[PDB]
């Protein structure tokens, strides 16, 4: 499924990530935006091996387990195909227990470089929540 903008938004929140560790909701769509295009069957090897799996392109080394990435740990304990689903849930299950890992969101490189210190709030203008 490739969300829209506000729907993403809309299932987000109602999964409870609009302010989770202090985020507002427009961190998050950004993220997403940036990371997979809004397509929950995004994936993308990275060099060490490794592959970034769903909407919020979360990483097989250390929070799910493909099968495939030598050293991985899987610390949300699910398989790296379930972050691929239409329903967000897993993803957003997952992602709650990164950025709380200690780095908040900069676990996203791409919130990081793309997201970080921008007007995010953009991101969920004219939404209905």
Same mark, same amino acid.
């Given at each position: ?5 506000? $729907?993403?938004? /809309? /299932? @987000? ?8 560790? !202090?985020?507002?909701? !427009? ?7 940036? $990371? ?13 091996? +490794? ?15 493909? !099968? ?8 949300? &304990?699910?398989?790296? +195909? /379930?972050?691929? +689903? ?13 950025? +709380?890992?200690?780095?908040? @969101? &900069? ?5 990081? &470089?793309?997201?970080? !210190? ?12």
């Amino acid at each position: 499924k490739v969300f829209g903008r506000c $729907e993403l938004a /809309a /299932a @987000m929140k109602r999964h409870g990530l609009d302010n989770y560790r !202090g985020y507002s909701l !427009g961190n998050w769509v950004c993220a997403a935006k940036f $990371e997979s295009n809004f397509n929950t069957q995004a994936t993308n090897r990275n060099t060490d091996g +490794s592959t970034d799996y769903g909407i919020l392109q979360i990483n097989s080394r250390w929070w799910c387990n493909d !099968g495939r990435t030598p050293g991985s740990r899987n610390l949300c &304990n699910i398989p790296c +195909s /379930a972050l691929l +689903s239409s329903d967000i849930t897993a993803s957003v299950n997952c992602a709650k227990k990164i950025v +709380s890992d200690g780095n908040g @969101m &900069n676990a996203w490189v791409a919130w990081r &470089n793309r997201c970080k !210190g921008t007007d995010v709030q953009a991101w969920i203008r004219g939404c209905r929540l």
